[PDB]
C-alpha cells in the first residue's frame, strides 16, 4: 500500500543543471541531458557512468529514447534537435526548423517519427530517417512545455504556458481536442497514461491532474508538492504499486497513490529543485535529477 524507495546511487558528472533523465526501454541504461550541453549515459542498475555524447551548441532541455533503445533524440536551446546513434555516439541528423529554444521531444512507439515542442509556440513532427520536418502545428499561443505520443502513435498531446492541453491527430495534424478546466494556469507538463485513456497534466499552481480526455473531464488531483516555476516531469509508476511520481521545487521526489491521491512517500536527498524523474520499465527503480545548485542524478529502489 506504500512503497519504500531508498537511495542506492548518486550519479555525478554534469557541470550544470540536469534537465531530463530517461530509462532506455530495454531497462539497461539511463540517459541524461543538461544545461552543460551534454548527454550522458549511465548503467540503470549500477549507476555506473558509461559515456558522454556531445554536439549541441547550447544547453539541452530534453532527451528521449527510440523504442529499440538504439537511438536518442535531444532538444536544445540552439533551436535544433539531434538524433544520436547511442553506441557510436554519432549525430545522425540535426533537425532544423524551430525559430527558438526546443523544449521537449519524443519518439512515437514505431520510432519512425519524432515530435517536438518549442518556445516558438509550435509543435513539429519529424521523419527520423530523412531528418525533415513533416508537419508544423500552430499548437499554442505560448511556449510548448511538453509533447507525447499515445500508445499506438495515432495521437499527440501537447501542453503550454497558455494554459491549454491539446490532442492532435498524428496523421492529419488536426487538433482533435482542447482541454479547459475551471481555470487555466500555465501547463508545465503533460503525457498519456500507458493505456492511452488518460492524460496527466502539471500546472504551475502546485497541482497535478489526471484527465479522461475522450470525455474531457478531470478525474484525479494530486497536491502537496511545490511547482510554480519549473516544467517538472511526472510519471506513471506501474512496475509495483500504481503510483504517480513527480519532482518538486522543495527538493523532494513526491510519490502519490494514484487512486486515493494520498502522498505515500517523499524522497529526501537532493539539494535543489528536482526537475525530472523517470520510472524503470520493469524494476521498482526511480531516477531523479536536480537543478544548478545540486547537479546530481539519484537512483532509488523500492521492494514494492
Ligand atoms: Cl533554470 C532552468 C530552467 C529549465 C531547465 O530545464 C528545462 C525544464 C526541464 N525540461 C523539460 N520539462 C518538460 C519537457 N522538457 C533547467 Cl536544466 C534549468
Curated annotation (Swiss-Prot):
Subcellular location field: Nucleus
Residue ranges of WD repeats: 13-52, 55-96, 98-138, 139-178, 182-223, 226-266, 269-303
Gene3D superfamilies assigned: YVTN repeat-like/Quinoprotein amine dehydrogenase
Annotated effect of mutating residue 195 to A: Loss of interaction with RBBP5 and reduced ability to stimulate KMT2A methyltransferase activity in association with RBBP5 and ASH2L
Entry's Gene Ontology BP terms: gluconeogenesis; negative regulation of transcription by RNA polymerase II; positive regulation of DNA-templated transcription; positive regulation of gluconeogenesis; regulation of cell cycle; regulation of cell division; regulation of DNA-templated transcription; regulation of embryonic development
Keywords: Acetylation, Chromatin regulator, Host-virus interaction, Isopeptide bond, Nucleus, Repeat, Transcription, Transcription regulation, Ubl conjugation, WD repeat
Important for interaction with histone H3 (site feature) positions: 77, 103, 233, 292
The protein, known as: WD repeat-containing protein 5
Organism per entry: Homo sapiens
Amino acid at each position: 500500500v506504500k512503497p519504500n524507495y531508498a537511495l542506492k546511487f548518486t550519479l555525478a558528472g554534469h557541470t550544470k543543471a540536469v534537465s531530463s533523465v530517461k530509462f532506455s526501454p530495454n531497462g539497461e541504461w539511463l540517459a541524461s541531458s543538461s544545461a552543460d550541453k551534454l548527454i550522458k549515459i549511465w548503467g540503470a542498475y549500477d549507476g555506473k557512468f558509461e559515456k558522454t555524447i556531445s554536439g549541441h551548441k547550447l544547453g539541452i532541455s530534453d532527451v528521449a529514447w527510440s523504442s529499440d533503445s538504439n537511438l536518442l533524440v535531444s532538444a536544445s536551446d540552439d533551436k535544433t534537435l539531434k538524433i544520436w546513434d547511442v553506441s557510436s555516439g554519432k549525430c545522425l541528423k540535426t533537425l532544423k526548423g524551430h525559430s527558438n529554444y526546443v523544449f521537449c521531444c519524443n519518439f512515437n512507439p514505431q520510432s519512425n517519427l519524432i515530435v517536438s515542442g518549442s518556445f516558438d509556440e509550435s509543435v513539429r513532427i519529424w521523419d527520423v530517417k530523412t531528418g525533415k520536418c513533416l508537419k508544423t502545428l500552430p499548437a499554442h499561443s505560448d511556449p510548448v512545455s511538453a509533447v507525447h505520443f499515445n500508445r499506438d502513435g495515432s495521437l499527440i498531446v501537447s501542453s503550454s504556458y497558455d494554459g491549454l492541453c491539446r490532442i492532435w491527430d498524428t496523421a492529419s495534424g488536426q487538433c482533435l481536442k482542447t482541454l479547459i478546466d475551471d481555470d487555466n494556469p500555465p501547463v508545465s507538463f503533460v503525457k498519456f497514461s500507458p493505456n492511452g485513456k488518460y492524460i496527466l497534466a502539471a500546472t504551475l499552481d502546485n497541482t497535478l491532474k489526471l484527465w479522461d480526455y475522450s470525455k474531457g473531464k478531470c478525474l484525479k488531483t494530486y497536491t502537496g508538492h511545490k511547482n510554480e516555476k519549473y516544467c517538472i516531469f511526472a510519471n506513471f509508476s506501474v512496475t509495483g504499486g500504481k503510483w504517480i511520481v513527480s519532482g518538486s521545487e522543495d527538493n523532494l521526489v513526491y510519490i502519490w497513490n494514484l487512486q486515493t491521491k494520498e502522498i505515500v512517500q517523499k524522497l529526501q536527498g537532493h539539494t535543489d529543485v528536482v526537475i525530472s524523474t523517470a520510472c524503470h520499465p520493469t524494476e521498482n527503480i526511480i531516477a531523479s535529477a536536480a537543478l544548478e545548485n545540486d547537479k546530481t542524478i539519484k537512483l532509488w529502489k523500492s521492494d514494492c
